[PDB]
Design a binder for this molecule. Structure first.
Ligand SMILES: O=C(C1=C(O)C(=O)N(c2ccc(O)c(C(=O)O)c2)[C@H]1c1ccc([N+](=O)[O-])cc1)c1ccccc1
Ligand SMILES: O=C(C1=C(O)C(=O)N(c2ccc(O)c(C(=O)O)c2)[C@H]1c1ccc([N+](=O)[O-])cc1)c1ccccc1
Lengths: 31, 219, 219, 31
């Protein structure tokens, strides 16, 4: 739901899967 | 009309959003008081089209930062951003032109006003000069203009009332870079939502608010 | 070269695949014996670009079927399919032109041959007339041409050896519409993979094989 | 992994979320 309906959730999904070891890009929750 | 609506739901289902935007564009211009459905389709269309960019955007920017090569990256982000200004620019006129001008109720007005602030906000995410500013301003004036109607014509639990609050509160903390004023708008909005909790769409927003605080309260 | 590779990994990360294909195209033509990495990037690029269409495709087709209006839908699918033929057509020449012609080892050859069958196969998914056929044929000749090398130059557990088997076996069951010959290729491939099980990439493929059977064995 | 690395898995994900009540579109697992 959060990774379904928020840019933040999505971004966090992708970055994890992509093994992207870059460090946390701060972000809040915006509808 | 019935076609583009339909043809739109296809692009939705199919997940070909950009095309979903068009079918909608058609719908708007091909028009009266746009219906809840269509309203919420035009959004989702733009929500996703735009959304995809911010995401591509952030990672990119995120990778650019790490490096400091960077030259190329920026080039790419350049290309990306260019796209942003577009969708944003697109949805906005459509707002001024057809949408707002017709609004005949709280939600509608609060709704659009809200939209108008969001994309203005999205424009604030990457713009740097005069633009960046005029955006932040436009953002504020937009949300505020909306808040005056919601906090007054809508129930503290009403999704929109909440939806606005959430984003508006991300505008401050993240755009204007002023945590204090944000939290209050956050908390204020959250509380008065409870004081009447006595569903699904609203409940899920109140949750995002709490997440924002606890998160903004921990840096 | 190093740039497009890099610029490619960006489009990957960013998840802007179509652009990932280009950077790769550049890479291929800008060339010798393409490196494992680049090889596996060109694929993933095409894998995703193409993949997105089949998906949009199926749902669509799936919705079209339900209805029987349908007119419009087909129109859309028309547009979609058009895209398919493109990517496919694209990756294929690049195969005949640069890739295959250079192959100097099992994997490489088995690898490409495999690719060449897959997109030919993807072409078989929606084509209807002379094309459809020449595809099925081209599919078969492609995979088979590969199978002769794998089953001989690669270990029954080798990913490719397996990768080929899986798809080839989906070609029969799904393209030629002949369950029997499929299962055997499936099972045969699966067993001889075990008989030597004594990782990660292979293991995950053997799992897909079993899923195909149990599924093909239940209709 | 299956919905990450196969057209079938992906399709099944989307169709479910999209509340798409159309009936199963048959499909196998292809890498
Ligand atoms: O609250 C109303 C809603 C809808 O109409 C509608 O479709 N909603 C909806 C459903 C499923 C979603 O997935 C999303 C989403 O995109 O999150 C949104 C509700 C909604 C609320 C606030 C926002 N918003 O501020 O971004 C966006 C959507 C409402 C009630 C009466 C009139 C008009 C609107
Ligand atoms: O087995 C070799 C693999 C790779 O090189 C490689 O990158 N793989 C890989 C990694 C992560 C993935 O997510 C995927 C995927 O897309 O499934 C694939 C392995 C692989 C195997 C079979 C196929 N295939 O038949 O579709 C595709 C990929 C190999 C070994 C030696 C030389 C060349 C190749």
């Amino acid at each position: 739901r959060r990774e379904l309906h928020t840019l933040k959730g999505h971004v966090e999904a992708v970055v994890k899967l992509k093994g992207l070891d870059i460090e946390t890009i701060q972000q809040s929750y915006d509808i | 009309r019935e076609e583009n609506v339909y043809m739109a739901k296809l692009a939705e289902q199919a997940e070909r959003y950009e095309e979903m935007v068009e079918f909608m564009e058609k719908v708007s211009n091909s028009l009266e008081e746009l219906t809840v459905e269509e309203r919420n389709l035009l959004s989702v269309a733009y929500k996703n089209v735009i959304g995809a960019r911010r995401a591509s955007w952030r990672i990119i920017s995120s990778i650019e930062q790490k490096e400091e090569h960077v030259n190329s990256i920026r080039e790419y982000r350049s290309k990306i951003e260019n796209e942003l200004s577009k969708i944003c620019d697109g949805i906005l006129k459509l707002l001024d032109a057809k949408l707002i001008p017709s609004a005949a109720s709280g939600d509608s007005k609060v709704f659009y006003l809200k939209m108008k602030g969001d994309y203005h906000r999205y424009l604030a995410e990457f713009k740097t000069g005069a633009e960046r500013k005029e955006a932040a301003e436009s953002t504020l004036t937009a949300y505020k203009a909306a808040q005056d109607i919601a906090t007054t014509e809508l129930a503290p639990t009403h999704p929109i009332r909440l939806g606005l609050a959430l984003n508006f509160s991300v505008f401050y903390y993240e755009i204007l870079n002023s945590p204090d004023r944000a939290c209050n708008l956050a908390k204020q909005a959250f509380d008065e939502a409870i004081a009447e909790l006595d569903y699904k769409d609203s409940t899920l927003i109140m949750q995002l608010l709490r997440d924002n605080l606890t998160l903004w309260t921990s840096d």
